[PDB]
Amino acid sequence: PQSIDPLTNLMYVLWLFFVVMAWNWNCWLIPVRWAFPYQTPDNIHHWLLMDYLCDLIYFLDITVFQTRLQFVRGGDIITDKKDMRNNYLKSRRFKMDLLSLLPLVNPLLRLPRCLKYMAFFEFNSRLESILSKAYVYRVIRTTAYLLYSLHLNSCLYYWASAYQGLGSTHWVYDGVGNSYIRCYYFAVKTLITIGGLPDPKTLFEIVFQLLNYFTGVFAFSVMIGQMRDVVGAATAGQTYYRSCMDSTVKYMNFYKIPKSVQNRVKTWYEYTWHSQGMLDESELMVQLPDKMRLDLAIDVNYNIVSKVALFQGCDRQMIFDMLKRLRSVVYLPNDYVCKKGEIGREMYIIQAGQVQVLGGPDGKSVLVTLKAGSVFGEISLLAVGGGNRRTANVVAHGFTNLFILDKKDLNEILVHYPESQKLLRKKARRMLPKLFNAALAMTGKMGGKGAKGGKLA
């Protein structure tokens, strides 16, 4: 790839992960080498080699990968090499990468390599974009933040112990063991405010302990608040569905709605939540851009609506408007979509489920079963109002989902398109002025002549 997309390239996500690992190595090992005596001259070459590897990763980030990132200017992607280079040089990420790449044997001289934190944020954004259910990764990231805070606390505790002498007091690290897990144990008992540690004696120890308990109270509060936000955001939809269901049940219980109707309402609520994951789709549709909603309506129902012979020859924008005006209604099993003799107003598109047309002697006979993608009742749309009645009983075999367009919405669409409105009136008149007056005049002339001729004879 000559040009790499910063958003949808998995190899760029892998390179970002490599840069994040280099930045994490720097951030997690600078205070270790500053505080702990682990940076001995015997094993200094491992540190130098891995620091050189991290600096090489930083260099091939700032010079190679970042300059090939395509960007947006006025909504258009730019693939040009010079334009991408100018965009990256203008951006503040180049400023931070230049600040980090500056070298400035002391581990604290490696400090501004921690200023390449932007790559970590872009890696977080890519991870939250690629995978659904991202609050588990948010929990992992917050736990990693807590681990790094305890890491810094461990390094600070070892520095304080070395400053006051190892084993001089009970509060400082005594000097036995791994020497990192003892200070990390101190950081865990301190920054979580668990306690149980030897009490500080000197003024420096009490000040350190005090500040570390204050930072630990606030860090534990950050942990709990992050987990609370994760729990609230993860269960927000379920909470809203339960609240709406409980409000409906409370409403039906206040008005003494019988158990059959309440059970049907609860069944619809559970089926809708388990099927489409939301109680209403138009609430989501109005939040989208108009072009997005139009294109989604097209992708859902355009072929099915254009397969209907009634609307053939109409304007395409009028078809689009009916697609936008379609409302999704879920019918329970054994529910009457169309009862025999009622006013027909609605055009039904079976998105899912089956619909049975009843008939025969004494009812209860399936004349025909309509599966998904079939449209019935479209003739009722072209009626003057009260002029259409359902001929046969129409029932839902199971949980069928019908995309429904009523006559009123069709009329408000049709007032905008005169040619298609005229075509629809023509089709309605064809399926069932000058010629009427000519026939009336011819009949009247013959009727008057018959009476005149009879009186003449």
Partner: protein, 493 residues
Amino acid sequence: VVVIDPSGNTYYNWLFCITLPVMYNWTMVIARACFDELQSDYLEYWLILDYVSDIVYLIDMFVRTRTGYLEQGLLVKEELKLINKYKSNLQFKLDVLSLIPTDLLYFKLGWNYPEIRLNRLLRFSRMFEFFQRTETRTNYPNIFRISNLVMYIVIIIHWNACVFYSISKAIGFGNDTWVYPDINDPEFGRLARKYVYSLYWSTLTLTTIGETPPPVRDSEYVFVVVDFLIGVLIFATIVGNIGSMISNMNAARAEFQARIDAIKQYMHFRNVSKDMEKRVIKWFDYLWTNKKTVDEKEVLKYLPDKLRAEIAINVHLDTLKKVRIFADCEAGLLVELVLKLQPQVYSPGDYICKKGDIGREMYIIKEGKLAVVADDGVTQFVVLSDGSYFGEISILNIKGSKAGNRRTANIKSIGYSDLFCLSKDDLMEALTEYPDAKTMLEEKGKQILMKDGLLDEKVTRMEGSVDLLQTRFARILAEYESMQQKLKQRLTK
């Protein structure tokens, strides 16, 4: 074939009956694996319970082969399709792995290793499904979510107790202060004491409380740090879940209070009189006390037309049929009119209408009592109880009315009255599809007014030009057709 409906009560009962062996496994497998005395002392009971658990696991797989799923709104009853649907799912692999006969490894490792039954833990999905179905089925979701969280934390604490006992066994009992003490002790050698001290240590570590012997060895330090971090995660999860539940339970109160204080801020901002402010505050106290803060339009907005129509019919159909004009109306028209009813609630002393006010809506008394009063309002002519109505003639708009959609009486709410108004525009919107019923309604209103003695442009302009233009094309076409006969007549001679 007999197919179990996943939405039915039988499926929930079997979910409980499979959760019991799953919970038994998830606790006692690790309990017996880590505490050797627990496995050895009650070996026959554990063998019987494990056999029963395996039997129930087999019946669970059989139920899974018989469990229908909604395909295109229909429950699938084809046994081959159900079996294929089960097998294609990962749950079939998990159930096969969970019933692998690892109990035959007792003959290779002895009875002291019940870790072979750790594969039985893979039936956790049945437990989770049963608990989520219980959450969706119970009438106390918050109490049950407390219970579910508490028992999950108890299970994790028991697991950490078993892990701590195993680590103390591996390091050595009584080797240092951190591990479990020497099991040759008469007090600390008891199995109950072993489990309860392990549980005490695990609770104190997983609740980030401490107050336990500090670690001595580096491995003990690593385990203590890791288990305290697991406890940090557990504590944050507990507090976050309970805080989210508290926010959910207080959300309705918070929204109602936000509305109340917003209206209070508006009333202070517009300098509304103190009596009117007190009336508003009394109204909101009545709303929250009687649990009437819900809005019918907002509550029923998600429901489809059929179900909302059914609920509204079960509320209003008898009373709307009791109305004289709507007594003979069609069932579909009655459904539409019932659906177009809007709730109105009036405080005691409120006036629903006054003499000379414009009458555009017809009121239905659902709950409460109304009074017809004079101009002063002290006297009452008649008291209208629930199920009564007034203003049915005003919405009809009968031509020749003396009132002219104007109220002729003063209606006062004696107490808190729940009324349902049917506006004139809603009535014509319902009557658009019922022209014959509309004509019948006008005739009925005319008859009532006669019994009461209360009865005594551009479209055509464009139509004339349009008809003339259409007739001119026909006349031109008729002349052209007649010209062919005239041309043929000339050619005939």
